[PDB]
Symmetry: C3
Subunit: 243 residues, 3 copies
Amino acid sequence: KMCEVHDKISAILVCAHVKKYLATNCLNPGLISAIQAGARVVPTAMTDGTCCRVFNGKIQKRRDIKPGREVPEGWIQTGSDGHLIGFMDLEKGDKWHYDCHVKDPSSPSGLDINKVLCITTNKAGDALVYEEVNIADLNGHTVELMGPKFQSNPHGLKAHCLMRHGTVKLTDFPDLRDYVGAEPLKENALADIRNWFLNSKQGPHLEGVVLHLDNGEMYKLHRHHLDLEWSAKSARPLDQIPL
Amino acid sequence: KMCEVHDKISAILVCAHVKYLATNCLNPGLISAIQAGARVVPTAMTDGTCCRVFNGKIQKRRDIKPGREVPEGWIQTGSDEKSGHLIGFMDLEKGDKWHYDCHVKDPSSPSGLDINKVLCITTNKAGDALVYEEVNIADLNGHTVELMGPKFQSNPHGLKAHCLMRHGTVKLTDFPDLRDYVSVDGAEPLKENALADIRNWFLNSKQGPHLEGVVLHLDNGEMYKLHRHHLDLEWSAKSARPLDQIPL
Amino acid sequence: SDKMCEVHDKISAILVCAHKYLATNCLNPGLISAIQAGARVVPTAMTDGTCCRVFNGKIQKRRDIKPGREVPEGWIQTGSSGHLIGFMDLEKGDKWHYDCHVKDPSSPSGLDINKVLCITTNKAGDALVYEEVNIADLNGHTVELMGPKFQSNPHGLKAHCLMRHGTVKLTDFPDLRDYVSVDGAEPLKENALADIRNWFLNSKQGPHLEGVVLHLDNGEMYKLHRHHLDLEWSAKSARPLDQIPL
Ligand SMILES: Nc1ncnc2c1ncn2[C@@H]1O[C@H](COP(=O)(O)OP(=O)(O)OP(=O)(O)O)[C@@H](O)[C@H]1O
Ligand SMILES: Nc1ncnc2c1ncn2[C@@H]1O[C@H](COP(=O)(O)OP(=O)(O)OP(=O)(O)O)[C@@H](O)[C@H]1O
Ligand SMILES: Nc1ncnc2c1ncn2[C@@H]1O[C@H](COP(=O)(O)OP(=O)(O)OP(=O)(O)O)[C@@H](O)[C@H]1O
């Protein structure tokens, strides 16, 4: 039901890039066009790690190749930003990408190649949990690899794990349909969204928000667009997030 | 209704040099003020940089040694005795990127800042939690505030952004009523171990683990503080629970 | 005086480990044997600090003597790798060992050498509390000295503490008797390694704990570190110890 991360994701709001960000109240035109077309908008949680995917029972790390640079052996394109986006198989030196596999000291690889640790929604929809799942369950899906050795573990995760994008659906997130022949009801999307991250129950756990839509489109917003900080100190642990 | 930070704040308990450690003796001035009929309100001490909203601008504090030069616009507000320094405030300088950064960003401003709008952390409607809120800086005019966040003291409070807080906002609950340690009209005080009970509060209370210390705000305008270091406790992000989730 | 064990030796692993020493799904033979014998097994929390004890009325730091070095004056042997295990009086340089004492600016040392700050279970066993205690109350017992200057304070302690080993009893920890042959019959449960790992990840207490040490009725102890279960231990991967539910 959720979309796959195969190309760069536009921002929910129009944002100038100062080389900081200068966010505005103006929504992405594509989002307006889609909302008016009647697509459903599902806000999901943005987690901080390294983009990956499961592709035929193996993990593939995302790599963006910039103009004129060697395309690695095994790179498969999936979009084009102004660099090329795509995915490839792990190399020998990808120790921490392999570490999310469950261990097997009595194998030639030391790894159970068929099982990876995941953080996902429990049986209820009230809390996350760590679960050793069959890597095949994630075939064809983009995931976020997180843990100690990725981005300084801002989420406080206890072990390298994978999380299928869109897993965490946000509660009480501003309904962006309210900002879109009638005049919009609400008009301060930047403030209202910034307020959700500052003062909601889930915001303080999250790096941002990525909207998944029916048309397969996505629209993201990082804490930096909202003039907010993202770090371990400014983040509450992910495995404590309320769902 | 709370006091203004314009001078150095004395210690609730007489401290001893070793490092300054609090002892089990109340400050003579606090004894005198409590016997003179003064209300004492325990507030939360929070770790940032001392500022104030003078007129409609943020002003940063700057102390000066008497044998030095006064910067333009500097305004003296008090004077330390131990160090002999001059206590005062100042209009922000062009380099104070993170002092300015608590203003709300404004695409319609030639500087990208709404200079009449600041982010502040304050008590919510009910009074059971803190919330971040964009306010008109004029509401803080005339008051001293603690500027906090990522780039101030290494963000021990885990704040998600640079913000201001009015001094005295967080009123403490279950903090020892220091009148039970003062001789009432001539009689033995009711309680004896102010140091132990206050240290026990910081360690085991529900608010202590979130706080750098305590500041007493009295009707006299006087203030008396205690830092965690006076009580032989650590202050750091690892030893602090996030301020935004402090129980009130 | 207390019914918990004394850390005077090395502690074996609850599970047989491989090779980094990762635990496998097999129980330590000595543990299986002790269990079948009918020993009481009390799971307790493992906390990260440094091993000490309260002897006479003084804190003593544990030092392991390698077989090719000299024994320090005042070093008591208590155990047996090929190194001996013993305890010392604190040296003048152990600033942060002495820092768990209650300060006293009127005494020659700056410390009240008769009182130490410890972290223990409160009147009701529902939370942990910091408590200034007469050091003699701990005499003869081994403690974990923790705080800001020890392993980078992964537990987020607000001050250097002493905690009697075994103070924190674990809730909903796998009962390792259902994993041992009872009267020769098949054990009730087979996957100790999986059940234990899922506890450290998804239990209420696990995320606060470096590991688990079992305290047996016969003085034995058996342990598991987060590393034995392929898990991270660090301040970022650890919830504050003073907030652990009990
Ligand atoms: N639920 C989610 N939906 C989509 N992306 C998610 C989600 N959770 C985490 N992410 C991560 O967010 C990233 C979104 O950033 P984007 O695709 O624009 O590329 P980028 O290299 O991070 O770009 P930028 O430098 O502009 O931040 C995705 O690549 C993915 O790794
Ligand atoms: N609620 C509060 N009431 C008063 N001051 C507060 C409060 N919260 C934080 N503060 C800060 O506490 C500081 C009080 O400390 P003070 O000026 O006495 O010296 P100091 O920087 O702590 O140094 P020292 O310990 O050497 O005297 C003020 O700078 C003020 O910014
Ligand atoms: N509840 C507890 N019971 C026993 N020991 C505990 C407890 N909590 C913490 N500890 C610490 O665990 C240590 C037990 O581990 P041990 O001495 O065998 O080695 P280690 O430091 O864990 O390392 P290694 O795996 O290299 O042997 C004791 O020294 C003690 O300091």
